Amino acid sequence: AFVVTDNCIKCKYTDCVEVCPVDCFYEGPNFLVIHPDECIDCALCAPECPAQAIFSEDEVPEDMQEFIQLNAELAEVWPNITEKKDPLPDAEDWDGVKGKLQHLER
Ligand code: SF4
Ligand code: F3S
C-alpha cells in the first residue's frame, strides 16, 4: 500500500488521483488518504504529488510512521475522490512546513 504523509495536509493538490488505476483515494477537508486494501502498489501516484507526500509503506520515514495507520482508519470514513480538483488556496505557503498533523481536520 502507498501512504499519504504530512506534507499533503493543507496543500491537497489532488494531482495524485489522476493516475490511480483503482481509485483508492478518500477525501477529507484538507488531506487525502490511500485505502490500503484497495491500493495495488503500482507506484504511479508518488511521482505525481507536488508536495512529495506519498510513500511506499515500507519507505515511510521513521518520524511519519503514524500516517500508515491514519490512512487506514480515515479511509474507512472519508468519501472516495476520483477527479482532480484545485489545490487548497494557500497550498504553497504550507508546502514544506513540517508538523502539519496538528492541523488535520476530520
Ligand atoms: S500506488 Fe497505485 S493503486 Fe496505490 S494509490 Fe498510488 S496510484 Fe493508486
Ligand atoms: S498534496 Fe496530497 S492530494 Fe495528492 S497530490 Fe499530494 S498526496
From Swiss-Prot:
Keywords: 3Fe-4S, 4Fe-4S, DNA-binding, Electron transport, Iron, Iron-sulfur, Metal-binding, Repeat, Transport. Coiled coil: none annotated. It holds the Pfam family Fer4. Residues 83-106 are annotated as: Disordered. Residues 1-29, 30-59 form the 4Fe-4S ferredoxin-type domain. GO terms for molecular function: 3 iron, 4 sulfur cluster binding; 4 iron, 4 sulfur cluster binding; DNA binding; electron transfer activity; metal ion binding. Residues 95-106 have a biased composition (Basic and acidic residues). Signal peptide: none annotated. Its cofactor is [4Fe-4S] cluster; [3Fe-4S] cluster. [4Fe-4S] cluster binds at C20, C39, C42, C45. Gene3D superfamilies: 3.30.70.20. InterPro entries: 4Fe4S_Fe-S-bd, 4Fe4S_Fe_S_CS, 7Fe_ferredoxin, Fd_C, FdxA, RnfB_subfamily. Binds 1 [4Fe-4S] cluster. It comes from the Bacteria. PROSITE patterns: 4FE4S_FER_1, 4FE4S_FER_2. [3Fe-4S] cluster binds at C8, C16, C49. The keyword GTP-binding does not apply. Ferredoxins are iron-sulfur proteins that transfer electrons in a wide variety of metabolic reactions. This ferredoxin could play a role in regulating gene expression by interacting directly with DNA. This is Ferredoxin-1. It comes from Azotobacter vinelandii. The gene is fdxA.
